[PDB]
Amino acid sequence: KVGRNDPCPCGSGKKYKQCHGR
């Protein structure tokens, strides 16, 4: 589990909930 509130690990710029996270 990751802190969706943190910039996606992919390194795109958007947070999980905004990127891969969702």
Ligand SMILES: [Zn+2]
């Ligand atoms: Zn991503």
